[PDB]
């Protein structure tokens, strides 16, 4: 009889809504207006979005 059904928790995605913008007056502080990413390479060297 089909009586036993398991459930597993999984990550379906991420929340890509715009984060809270903090005005700091610093020249080297940048925030992406709307959607978009900054391409950076980590310690190993593989590129990725941040």
């Amino acid at each position: 009889h089909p009586s036993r059904v398991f459930s597993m928790t999984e990550r379906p995605g991420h929340n890509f809504a715009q984060g809270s913008v903090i005005t700091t007056g610093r020249d080297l502080d940048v925030t992406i207006e709307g959607s978009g990413w900054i391409s950076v390479l980590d310690h190993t060297g593989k590129e990725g979005l941040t």
Binding site: H1, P2, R4
Partner: protein
């Protein structure tokens, strides 16, 4: 006539089958937790034919990844029934000799 085969009937074989059945049920209960073990059932009519086998039990519920098809609720009931019937077979076969001895000795 007048031979032990006819005097004892089939009660001489039933006691053995009830012992084999009890062994299989004991195996099923012990192997209930070991994954991959398939519950074994004994067909009574097969040992009846052998007197005059070791099958598999199809589960009523799915496994949980173990593959073990032993239902401990079923095994306890089947062990209780076999033990009760085993005692009756001893009573039946035991009285066969008690009547047989009384006929010979006349007392």
């Amino acid at each position: 006539a007048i031979s032990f085969d006819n005097a004892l009937g089939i009660h001489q074989h039933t006691v053995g089958v009830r012992e084999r059945n009890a062994e299989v049920i004991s195996t099923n209960i012990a192997q209930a937790n070991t994954p991959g073990y398939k519950a074994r059932g004994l067909d009574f009519a097969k040992e009846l034919q052998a007197a005059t086998d070791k099958l598999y039990r199809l589960p009523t519920q799915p496994d949980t990844g173990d593959g073990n098809t032993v239902d401990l609720d079923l095994e306890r009931n089947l062990f209780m029934q076999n033990q009760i019937r085993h005692q009756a077979s001893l009573d039946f076969l035991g009285s066969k000799f008690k009547n047989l001895t009384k006929a010979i000795k006349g007392e």
